[PDB]
Each structure stands twice: as structure tokens, then as C-alpha cells.
């Protein structure tokens, strides 16, 4: 297992869901190679788990400014991949 | 003394209409939860019950009853009405009711014939 | 609003603490920096720094956006308290007149029946005292009137 | 011919009531979106233009007009109004307008004096 | 005005709405040098104009998979800059 340490760069969250995000994003990165598809996989899996709807981006060079639901916003780094995921809707 | 009694009989008394609206809402709605299908039935029963009670009063008033029933989803609700009549005789009564999941605003207007 | 203005007082009591906590965060935001240049292995359940800093900035912004705003519109509350204390003074004068009229100091009245009457008077007098003291405490807590 | 013209002058024309309500609503709100703090002002406007322009008609009618404004967030919409008057001289007109995020229904009732 | 041709990849929203996005996005790119500030500009001006809640993503490479309400989706390129703007709230 490639130990890609997670550095979560912002979160209005509980910790358990943040670590779920880290683990499943690591799983998606291990499973797929397309940033759009990584975000897609993570978005469906949280939509299934903690009820819709989120918005997930996976990439290297991107900047974001959105409005999210309270206690439902995370943004972290795995390896060289920044992953944002916020619930709004 | 007789003139006061006649005026009270012929006047649009607000609290009586308010209690009529309460009785109509309680009978038609009660504690049942909001359902899209039953909204039309609830509104029709409320309005017809209010109209029937207002007519049974025997007062020479043309009665106008409007009912709004509302799902509670965080949306603010405001109903306003500014109208011209002869304020000495005609009257209006707007009453708001609510439960855990529903609002209900009923406006009854009585106009002297 | 009393309870509300109570919480209003509460939020002022938090302001200093906010600054306090803020500077702690400042101290913290230095120490955690050492953490990465001392090569720390950050645990998974460790909530990472930027998370808390973002959400705390959001906290402070929302508080100072809305609590202050709701604080300025207090004139309606001010006039409500004014009329409330005016009614309290009117009821106090009415109770004064009732006490002057009600004086059972004469010995002809039955001690038990006059005792029950004085007990009803003392119950409503305690209610009046509670009303007066709660109006005064709301006035001094709001402290703008 | 004169009798028909007089009847039209003294009649409650539904089309002009719909037009006047639409004009009042469009002037008051127009392209503005839903804002909870401004629902009060929007309703007050809608009703005051409606009543003023209805009074400018000059018809011998007592006017009762009600405005309801809604956020679009999935909540249900309905307006039910059953009334008792003389159908030959008194009339009603309900106008529903909707935009991207807001519903506005205004019901105007004109009763002969 | 540098005619950065807005080659528009994905779009579920009207053409005037597209052109408003493109014009004020040229505005954001010509005014700001940080993609985060560009996205904040665009989201804020869409929140002012087309009501909350908007979500703007400005970047050079990223993978996005989000749920948007109908008639409220754009994903285009200004020069090499990818811009994804969608409403959800």
C-alpha cells in the first residue's frame, strides 16, 4: 500500500466523515486514473452513504469558492492530488 | 339598550368569525399530516364550513372565504390584504394556524349588503 | 426577548474569549508549524489545522455579521420593556391601593379567613415582585435602556 | 345601446382586473427574486397599486384584494376562495404569476355597494 | 480585449446565459490573477445576478463530477483555462 498521507486543507466536518473521505479517495485513486472519474466515484459513494447531494473535484491545479451545507464540507490532499468535496443542495 | 343589541347583531364581530375559522380548520384538518392529495379536500371543507357557519349567523353580510394550506420546509409565509369598504359596517378576519408540518391562513370578509 | 437578550449578554461575554481563543489559535498556528518541520506523522482522526482555521473564520464572520445586526434593532425591544415596566408600576400602585383597602388589622375578622385573604394577597404580591424584578433584570441586562 | 354601455360601465370586468393585477405585480416586483425580508414590502406595494388603480376606475364597488408571495423550494401552491354574494353584480378574479424562484397570487373581489 | 475564444465543451443552460458567463468570466480573468479569486468573482456575481447558490471552478487541470439543477450548467475554456460553473443549492 502506497502511504499517501492526507493533509486536509479545509473542513466544516466531523472527523469520522473526513477520515472516510480520505480512505475512499485513496481507494478511488488506487482503482482509477481519471480525475473526473475519481471525483465521480467518490461523489456516488458519499451520495449513497450520507444522502445526496455533494459535489466533488479531483485535480492538481484548480481553485474553488463555493457555499456548502454546515458540517458537510471537506478539502484535502492525497499524494499530489487535491480533492474537494462539499454538500450543497 | 335595544340599539346596542341591534348593532351587535348586525355588526361583523371578529372573534365569532375567528372561532368559526378555528372550528372549520379543526374539523377539516385536525392533526393529520400534510399530503398533496388531501390539500384540495381540506381547503374545500374549511371554506364551505366557514361559509355555512357565517350564513347560519343570520347577519346580512356577503361572505368571502380564502384558505391557504402550507407545507413546512423553511419557506417564509406572508399574506397581506389592504381593502376599501365602509369601515363602520364591513369587517375582515385573517387567522393563522399551524402544526409541526403545516401552516394554514384563512381570511374571511363580511360586507354589509 | 429577556432570554434572548440574556444570550445577547452571553455573546458579549464570549467576545473576549473569542479573542482569547483566537490568540491561542495564533499560538497554536505557530506550534503546529513546528509540527511539520519537526516531521510529525499526523494521525487520521487528527483534524488537520486548515480545517479548523477555515471553520473558525467562518464562525467569527457569521457571528459578527448577524449578532451585531440583530443588536442594533433593539428599539422595538426597548419600547416593549418600557411599556412592560410602566404596566408593572401601574400594577404596583394598584396593589398599594389594594393593601391600604384590605388592611385586616381589626380583630373582628376571623384569623383563618382573613389569613386566607392575606395569603391570596401575598401570592399575587409575590407575583408582582417577580414581575418587577424580572423587568429590572431585563433592563439591566439589555443595559441600553 | 345606452343601457349596454351603462351596464358595462357598472359591471365587474374580469379582464381589466387581471390586467390591473398583472401591472401592479410587475411594477412592484418585476424581475426581482425572492427575498424573505422584502416580501412585506412587495406585498404592500402590490396591494397598494392594485387598490389605488381599482379606485381610479370609479366603479361603485367595494374592493377586497389579497396578495400571497412564495419562495420556490418545492412547497405546494393552491388558492381556494368560495364566497356568497350576488353573482349578477359582484365578481372575483384570481391572478397567479410565477418567476424562477417565487409565486405571487393576488385575488381581487369587487362587490356592489 | 484579448479575444480569448470561449470554446464551450458542456452546456445545459441558455445561450444568453452562456454569453453572460463568458463576458463576466473574461472580466474575472482580466481583473484577477488567482484562479481562486476568479472563481469567487464569478460565483458571487452569479449569486447576485442568477441567485444562489452558484459554484465556480477555475483551473488548468481538474476532474469534476457534480449534480446541477437543469438549465444551470456550463463548462468551457477561456484560452487554456477551464471554467466550470453550475448552480446547486
Radius of gyration of chain B: 15 Å
What is the strand content of chain B?
A: 25-35%
Helical/strand content category of chain B: alpha+beta
Q: Could you give the order of strands across the largest sheet of chain B?
A: 1-4-3
**What is the N-to-C succession of helices and strands of chain B?**
HHHEEEE
What is the rounded distance between the termini of chain B? 24 Å
The structural class of chain A is: alpha+beta
Largest interface: B-D, 39 and 36 residues
Q: What kind of sheet is the major sheet of chain A? A: 4 strands, antiparallel
Number of domains of chain A: 1
Give the overall silhouette of chain B.
elongated
Order of helices and strands of chain A: EHHEEE
Coiled coil (chain C): 9-90
Organism (chain C): Homo sapiens
Family (chain C): Belongs to the dynein heavy chain family.
Modified residues (Phosphoserine) (chain C): 68
Word description of this protein:
This is part of a larger assembly, with 2 copies of chain A (89 residues), 2 copies of chain B (113 residues) and 1 copy of chain C (145 residues). Chain A is built from 2 helices and 4 strands; from the N terminus they run βααβββ. Chain A has 89 residues and is of the alpha+beta class. In chain A, strands 1-3-4-2 form a 4-stranded antiparallel sheet. The N and C termini of chain A lie far apart (35 Å). In chain A, 46% of the residues are buried. Chain B starts with a helix and ends with a strand. The longest helix of chain B is centred in the middle third of the chain and has 21 residues, at 36-56. Chain C is elongated and about 95 Å long. In chain C, helix 1 (2-37) runs antiparallel to helix 2 (49-72) and helix 3 (75-102) runs antiparallel to helix 4. Chain C contains 4 helices and no strands. At the B-D interface, helix 3, strand 1, strand 2 and strand 4 of B face helix 3, strand 1, strand 2 and strand 4 of D. Strand 2 of chain A pairs antiparallel with strand 2 (54-66) of chain E. The PDB classes it as motor protein.
Amino acid at each position: 500500500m502506497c502511504d499517501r498521507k492526507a493533509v486536509i486543507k479545509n473542513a466544516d466536518m466531523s472527523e469520522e466523515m473526513q477520515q472516510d473521505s480520505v480512505e475512499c479517495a485513496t481507494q478511488a485513486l488506487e482503482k482509477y486514473n481519471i480525475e473526473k472519474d475519481i471525483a465521480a466515484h467518490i461523489k456516488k459513494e458519499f451520495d449513497k452513504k450520507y444522502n445526496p447531494t455533494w459535489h466533488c473535484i479531483v485535480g492538481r491545479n484548480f481553485g474553488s469558492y463555493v457555499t456548502h451545507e454546515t458540517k458537510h464540507f471537506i478539502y484535502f490532499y492525497l499524494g499530489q492530488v487535491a480533492i474537494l468535496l462539499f454538500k450543497s443542495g | 339598550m335595544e340599539d346596542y343589541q341591534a348593532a351587535e347583531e348586525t355588526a361583523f364581530v371578529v372573534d365569532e368569525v375567528s372561532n368559526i375559522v378555528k372550528e372549520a380548520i379543526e374539523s377539516a384538518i385536525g392533526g393529520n399530516a400534510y399530503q398533496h392529495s388531501k390539500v384540495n379536500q381540506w381547503t374545500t371543507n374549511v371554506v364551505e364550513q366557514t361559509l355555512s357557519q357565517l350564513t347560519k349567523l343570520g347577519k346580512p353580510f356577503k361572505y368571502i372565504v380564502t384558505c391557504v394550506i402550507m407545507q413546512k420546509n423553511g419557506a417564509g409565509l406572508h399574506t397581506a390584504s389592504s381593502c376599501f369598504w365602509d369601515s363602520s359596517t364591513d369587517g375582515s378576519c385573517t387567522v393563522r394556524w399551524e402544526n409541526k408540518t403545516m401552516y394554514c391562513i384563512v381570511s374571511a370578509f363580511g360586507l354589509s349588503i | 426577548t429577556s432570554d434572548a437578550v440574556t444570550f445577547i449578554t452571553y455573546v458579549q461575554s464570549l467576545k473576549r474569549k473569542i479573542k482569547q481563543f483566537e490568540k491561542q489559535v495564533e499560538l497554536y498556528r505557530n506550534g503546529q508549524r513546528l509540527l511539520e518541520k519537526q516531521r510529525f506523522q499526523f494521525p487520521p482522526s487528527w483534524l488537520y489545522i486548515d480545517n479548523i482555521e477555515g471553520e473558525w473564520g467562518a464562525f467569527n464572520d457569521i457571528m459578527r455579521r448577524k449578532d451585531s445586526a440583530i443588536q442594533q434593532q433593539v428599539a422595538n425591544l426597548q419600547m416593549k420593556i418600557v411599556q412592560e415596566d410602566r404596566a408593572v408600576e401601574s400594577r404596583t400602585t394598584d396593589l398599594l391601593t389594594d393593601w391600604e383597602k384590605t388592611k385586616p388589622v381589626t380583630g373582628n375578622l376571623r384569623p383563618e379567613e382573613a389569613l386566607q385573604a392575606l395569603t391570596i394577597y401575598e401570592g399575587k404580591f409575590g407575583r408582582l415582585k417577580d414581575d418587577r424584578e424580572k423587568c429590572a433584570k431585563a433592563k439591566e441586562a439589555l443595559e441600553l435602556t
